[PDB]
Design a protein around this ligand. Structure first.
Ligand SMILES: [Zn+2]
Length: 63
DNA sequence: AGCCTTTGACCAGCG
DNA sequence: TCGCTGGTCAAAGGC
């Protein structure tokens, strides 16, 4: 489960990418007409979670 | 009812 | 040309 960020997301895939221990998850912003997506993947070194966003939101943070 | 995660299949770029 | 592979599709099931 990914960290909260004030936006609403839907998970739409998960893949174990080469050179990673932990699988990577793919989410999309459920705002219709908004196509921001983000990737989420943990890593053991330093207990790290990288969240990578592609695209700027169409709209204010949901109510 | 509607929206979520899970999942293997599908996909397109490229070495 | 054709596999590998990171990214996406969508059916199935659960709440
Ligand atoms: Zn958005």
């Amino acid at each position: 489960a990914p960290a909260e960020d004030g936006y609403n997301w839907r998970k739409y895939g998960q893949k174990l990418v080469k050179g990673s221990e932990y699988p990577r998850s793919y989410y999309k912003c459920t705002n219709p007409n908004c196509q921001v997506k983000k990737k989420v993947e943990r890593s053991r070194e330093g207990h790290i979670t990288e969240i990578i966003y592609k695209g700027a939101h169409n709209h204010l943070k949901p109510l």
